[PDB]
Assembly symmetry: C5
Homo-oligomer: 311 residues x 5
């Protein structure tokens, strides 16, 4: 089987369509997601054209081996997709209507900078390498691009499944390659975060601020240091939820800031005690009294500054 | 092999049945469960009809390659099922009786809101795509829908295995599809949780309440803060058992409330000390005395409120 | 290939035998184990009978495709076994000596109630579905049921590999099914437990009992609460070894009891302090003095009760 | 199919080229990385030569089964690559132009001594075993050696993808083997480290140094020991990020040094207290006063020494 | 294809050779290791002999399907090896020279008693089952037994790759089987251990010994108990490195001893305080003074006894 010949010198148009059946296994660390979808393909092969009246049939059904089918691959997959041809149908003019059900693990980069208020665009790149006899170009049949209503991705709101109609045609290793960008838009379900992550983390930090209404150095050391341990322990507890990024994230910055605050609170506690011990309790008391306002205010201000920088 | 032709214009009825052999690997995080079962299929193909008299046989046995078999797939599977044809049997009228043993990893969403007193409905969706020559419709042979008595799912009580008789017929990618909902009802085995999770978690919270029979600020800071660490550590210890939900769960609400109580207990401890230090021990003593009743009562009340809201 | 025909109306006997080559991956949580073994099958097919004198051969060797072989499956496997036919041999009478090497992941429930002094019976259920032409029944050739001496399962003592000779013949989906129970008996290697789990866990509890020879409420709060943290931390450390059971285990009950003891020790510590503070040190001292004997005695008593209930 | 025969006694030159499509799953522990790339092969097999005039085509396309293709393997792969032949193109001289898309898990050792400021050279070794009829030698077509601009490896900066043109020809098991070294140069994205790992780890160590402005042995024991716990807990928190090396890493030497500092700080705290208790507070005060400068200075010096030794 | 016939009644000798290409994934817990190697096989089949003069060629190349090849399997593999036939070569006398490249996950037990100063012998057991027509016996061609110099196993020093020349012949399931033991000797790279595991673990224990230069019961309780927590936390931190053995290991014994020492140190701390409180400070002081020497001495001694006991 050879490709259909051009009437003039025109490229072959392969009309594509992806319909999402199942969407699962979004791995935040691996930046991969698993997909189970239909891949629809369409092209004209005049060599397959028939007279419906003499044939008695409106449509002819073929086996994949029997006819020429374009070699469509995905760019951003781990291994080649597991595909099962559902149907091949030929109409009198030689139009081929191909359909297969496939499962694939797709590599799509994720941006955690706005976590947990982040939205993501998942990419599925379709590609075709042109042959010596003729050039092959990809196209999008928007009527054949969809997703099952039941498609769920735990922790995310599935916004849209679309395709960038204009293919990316380019040369690679002395041949033409026509690329298609299919986009799955998702946004994170940030509710649970507040009572599960933020709130208990703020309570632990607020407990260390009680050292500003105490003069007992022993009680203060216990308050600041024991809360620091509790904070680390709490982080270990929530660790699963927070992401491992090589860059600086919003939640990541807040966490860093909380660590800085434990350090500054220690300095205060240490300073207050040294002044008291070095017989200047008026200064010690003024610093502690100031800290009572300074700490929440500077925290609230710095949080506003961060939120602004990230959004 | 082409599909059997219609006598008039009627669709082909494929009588289905699923008999559960093994049920295992219910992954609470992935919302997947592995199944090992029999899939029974039955349809009429008159091209296979024979006279039992001139043949001498009551039944004819065929190889899957030899005859036409409908392309039945599952909707909510990760990859296509691993199937092995057990038997194909044609009765004289041309009625085919297909049987295969298959294993599949099924995606079924789970609702953790009532954990660990939650019940779940696991779905197995059967599907058939209609062809150009004829429409195919799925049906349920209730005598062929069952489950092995030995079917076990560690941590769950297997209630029922049933099917929604009326198929969901709809159009997809320009062709008809007939869908069947098979339901596996399971309810959780919540015993262990009381002595394993709830009770030790209540003991740690009760230890913090002893700060209401103490005046030593140092001892009180140690009681409240060290129990807070112990609580977090205990949560890390039970972490495996509790589920990672993007929404608010019953167990998760209790946990949040316990965090709030540690914060309020700190406020009390802090207030009691400030009043004492600021020379008003009568108020400090009244607050501590009240807390002794207030804390258990408010706890018991808010737990009743929560239980009521969730159940 | 069709099944061998019956002389009268008798069922076909398939003589089975499993010889364990390798045993590995016993997953305590999944209740699965991986197996690599030989499966031997034997039956008489008179159509295959030959004259050794004219043939010059004592035995004829066939390819699996060439002759009829019974469809033997395992009930409690995840997916169908990976089998490789080692040999097929026919003797002049038509006796078939089949042999294959297979690997499979077996689902066998485990009972953790007596952990770490538990023994288990692993099941491998062989099955054959009868055909329309004749009934098939399984049998056990005990000379062909064994296990390699080198078979090891880390942490267990491999007791025996046997089969329940009497098959379980029953009806399923309108046909006869003959089932065989192969049993692998294993018992746990509980040595390490004592120095690794029990002993350090008892030492931490005993440290908390030193609060009965102290009057310092601050030192006592530190002893009881810090040991409670240490206990939880130790549990997190050993967590890998202990099992996640939905029911009550022996080891599990001891752990619960240890949590109760930390709570009672807190009550004592709290009571002793309140009496002292409320100017009744004679009562406080009597309670503490009693606790010194009460705590070890009640602990020892309850453990005896627990051991008795579980064994 | 046998190899093409030599015109004289010359070896067959196979011109190779690898073009990186996707780069993912760099496992720091396993020292493996997953790759999805094009493998281009080119050789002359005159047996395939054709007259374009008689054939009516300028280039002939073949199926892999139809012609002889060299047995190219990778040395450092886990299992054999998953390859899919994209195109086989024969020009009239008999020049074959092969192309396949493959995915493979490549084993390449990593050097963590300079982590997180480490750079790595990933190797992909191409190999061909010579046959009895003629010798096969590998070559590099540099125009066919590249990488997609979109190639990303989370946490790394992809420097270059090159090949050592000169093959490593050697004898193995009585036959010639021609080896090619393809090199992927990567350098780590160390930003996040500072606010994520170092900074909070330095703050915890600095908190322990406050014991040099305190005389309370109880407060000092709490400062040193509680910070030590906090440090260990923090290490458990960052454990995922730091690597498990059998040798000494730069980050690892810093961590070891931090442990030594907690030990020396304990000695000081212990010494200061013993001198005070043994009625020599002048010495105790001088040691503590010195420590205030000694500890940061010695730390800063030893970190400079470490950095120097590693870089 | 049948096996080559014997000239007299002699068995067929299959000359084997394994050449290690890659060695990876040594799983200390699973006691498995992955291996990528060449398997060379050689035997004489006179039915494949040819007159070099009449034939024209000295070596006849065959496809695996074309000739008889002995069924060689590995005993201690999880599933059957992934093999790819590299070459089949028949000399004029009928001497077959087989070569395949295979990858397999091999089960080999490990002995952790001397960890981290352990050495291991990894086994790869080759096996052949004899047939009805002829007995098959394995042999070792030592010139074909080797390993690539680049073979690395992170954390281990690869000592040797050898084979026990004398096969283990025995009967199994009524037939003869010839077994070959190939041995890979490895020894652990124990450097990192000292600064990573031992040293920080000794520092934490030494901190607890400072309680012997203190009289403050509160400071002592804090020293002993807080270090005990730190020790457990440190163990959780290093847990990945240490192995899960059902038997007593050297490291495991040291760890147990360290737990005993924390318990004895508590007793001392408790005793010292009781004597002081019960008005006998002379005894309390003598015990504490003795402990200062007793604890390090008894520790150092018990370690020599342990070291000797294990080596
Ligand atoms: Cl693909
Ligand atoms: Cl399916
Ligand atoms: Cl099976
Ligand atoms: Cl390869
Ligand atoms: Cl094998």
């Amino acid at each position: 089987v050879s490709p259909p010949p051009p009437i003039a010198d025109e490229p072959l148009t392969v009309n594509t369509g992806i319909y999402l059946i199942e969407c699962y296994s979004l791995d935040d660390k691996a930046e991969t997601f698993k997909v189970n979808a239909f891949l629809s393909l369409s092209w004209k092969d005049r060599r397959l054209a028939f007279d419906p009246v003499r044939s008695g049939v409106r449509v002819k059904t073929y086996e994949p081996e029997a006819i020429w089918i374009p070699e469509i691959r995905f760019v951003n997959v781990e291994n080649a997709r597991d595909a099962d041809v559902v149907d091949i149908s030929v109409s009198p003019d030689g139009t081929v209507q191909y359909l297969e059900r496939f499962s694939a693990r797709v590599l799509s980069p994720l941006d955690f900078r706005r976590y947990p208020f982040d939205s993501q665009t998942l990419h599925i790149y379709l590609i075709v390498r042109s042959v010596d006899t003729r050039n092959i170009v990809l196209a999008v049949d928007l009527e054949k691009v969809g997703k099952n209503d039941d498609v769920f991705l735990t922790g995310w709101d599935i916004e849209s499944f679309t395709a960038v109609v204009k293919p990316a045609n380019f040369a690679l290793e002395d041949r033409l390659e026509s690329k298609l960008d299919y986009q799955l838009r998702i946004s994170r379900q940030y509710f649970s975060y507040i009572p599960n992550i933020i709130l208990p983390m703020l309570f632990i930090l607020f407990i260390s601020w009680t050292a500003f209404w105490s003069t007992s150095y022993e009680a203060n050391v216990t308050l600041v240091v024991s809360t620091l341990i509790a904070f680390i322990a709490f982080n270990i507890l929530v660790e699963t939820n927070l992401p491992k990024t090589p860059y600086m994230t919003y939640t990541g910055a807040i966490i860093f800031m909380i660590y800085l605050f434990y350090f500054v609170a220690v300095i205060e506690v240490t300073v207050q005690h040294y002044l008291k011990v070095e017989s200047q309790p008026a200064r010690a008391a003024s610093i502690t009294r100031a800290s009572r306002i300074a700490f929440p205010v500077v925290f609230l201000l710095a949080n506003i500054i961060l939120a602004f920088l990230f959004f």
